[PDB]
Amino acid sequence: XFXXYX
Ligand SMILES: *[C@@H]1O[C@H](CO)[C@@H](O)[C@H](O)[C@H]1O[C@H]1C[C@H]([NH3+])[C@@H](O)[C@H](C)O1
Ligand SMILES: *[C@H]1O[C@H](CO)[C@@H](O)[C@H](O)[C@@H]1O
Ligand SMILES: *[C@H]1C[C@H](N)[C@@H](OC)[C@H](C)O1
């Protein structure tokens, strides 16, 4: 449920 991009 978060996103990113790391
Ligand atoms: C991430 O969210 C964006 C904005 O809502 C979408 O436009 C994008 O298509 C999404 O990224 C894709 C590819 C990604 N690797 C995957 O984890 C997500 C679910 O869908
Ligand atoms: C990727 O990892 C970073 C570092 O722990 C988090 O901040 C992020 O929420 C995701 O898990
Ligand atoms: C999300 C966008 C970001 N610029 C990328 O780093 C190379 C990451 C892997 O995906």
Side-chain angles (χ1 to χ4, degrees):
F2 168 66
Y5 300 87

Short mmCIF file of all heavy atoms in Angstrom, two decimals, unseen atoms left out:
data_model
loop_
_atom_site.label_atom_id
_atom_site.label_comp_id
_atom_site.label_asym_id
_atom_site.label_seq_id
_atom_site.Cartn_x
_atom_site.Cartn_y
_atom_site.Cartn_z
N UNK A 1 0.78 -1.22 0.00
CA UNK A 1 0.00 0.00 0.00
C UNK A 1 0.82 1.28 0.00
O UNK A 1 0.27 2.35 0.27
CB UNK A 1 -1.04 -0.25 -1.11
N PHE A 2 2.12 1.20 -0.28
CA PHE A 2 3.04 2.30 0.05
C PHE A 2 3.44 3.21 -1.12
O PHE A 2 3.15 4.40 -1.13
CB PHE A 2 4.30 1.70 0.73
CG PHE A 2 5.46 2.67 0.88
CD1 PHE A 2 5.37 3.78 1.71
CD2 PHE A 2 6.64 2.46 0.18
CE1 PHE A 2 6.44 4.66 1.82
CE2 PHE A 2 7.70 3.33 0.29
CZ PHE A 2 7.60 4.44 1.10
N UNK A 3 4.11 2.62 -2.11
CA UNK A 3 4.70 3.38 -3.20
C UNK A 3 6.23 3.12 -3.27
O UNK A 3 6.67 1.95 -3.25
N UNK A 4 7.00 4.19 -3.38
CA UNK A 4 8.38 4.05 -3.74
C UNK A 4 8.73 5.16 -4.78
O UNK A 4 8.05 6.20 -4.76
N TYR A 5 9.75 4.99 -5.62
CA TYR A 5 10.51 3.78 -5.84
C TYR A 5 11.90 3.95 -5.21
O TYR A 5 12.50 5.02 -5.22
CB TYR A 5 10.49 3.36 -7.35
CG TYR A 5 9.03 3.14 -7.67
CD1 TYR A 5 8.19 4.18 -8.08
CD2 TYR A 5 8.45 1.90 -7.43
CE1 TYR A 5 6.84 3.99 -8.25
CE2 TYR A 5 7.09 1.68 -7.61
CZ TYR A 5 6.28 2.73 -7.99
N UNK A 6 12.40 2.86 -4.61
CA UNK A 6 13.48 2.97 -3.66
C UNK A 6 14.84 2.92 -4.30
O UNK A 6 14.93 2.26 -5.48
CB UNK A 6 13.39 1.99 -2.52
C1 LIG B 1 2.08 2.71 -9.21
O1 LIG B 1 1.04 3.60 -8.95
C2 LIG B 1 0.91 4.52 -10.05
C3 LIG B 1 -0.02 5.68 -9.72
O2 LIG B 1 -1.22 5.28 -9.19
C4 LIG B 1 0.40 3.77 -11.27
O3 LIG B 1 0.28 4.67 -12.36
C5 LIG B 1 1.50 2.75 -11.65
O4 LIG B 1 1.06 2.01 -12.78
C6 LIG B 1 1.71 1.83 -10.43
O5 LIG B 1 2.81 0.97 -10.67
C7 LIG B 1 2.51 -0.23 -11.25
C8 LIG B 1 3.82 -0.96 -11.44
C9 LIG B 1 4.40 -1.32 -10.08
N1 LIG B 1 5.66 -2.09 -10.25
C10 LIG B 1 3.37 -2.12 -9.29
O6 LIG B 1 3.90 -2.41 -8.00
C11 LIG B 1 2.07 -1.34 -9.18
C12 LIG B 1 0.98 -2.14 -8.48
O7 LIG B 1 1.59 -1.01 -10.48
C1 LIG B 2 11.22 0.46 1.45
O1 LIG B 2 12.19 0.47 2.47
C2 LIG B 2 12.34 1.73 3.12
C3 LIG B 2 13.46 1.62 4.12
O2 LIG B 2 13.05 0.72 5.17
C4 LIG B 2 11.04 2.10 3.78
O3 LIG B 2 11.17 3.42 4.26
C5 LIG B 2 9.84 2.00 2.76
O4 LIG B 2 8.61 2.22 3.41
C6 LIG B 2 9.85 0.68 2.01
O5 LIG B 2 9.54 -0.37 2.93
C1 LIG B 3 11.24 4.11 -9.41
C2 LIG B 3 11.86 5.33 -10.09
C3 LIG B 3 13.32 5.47 -9.70
N1 LIG B 3 13.96 6.55 -10.49
C4 LIG B 3 14.05 4.16 -9.95
O1 LIG B 3 15.42 4.29 -9.56
C5 LIG B 3 16.29 3.82 -10.59
C6 LIG B 3 13.36 3.06 -9.17
C7 LIG B 3 14.07 1.73 -9.35
O2 LIG B 3 12.03 2.94 -9.64
#
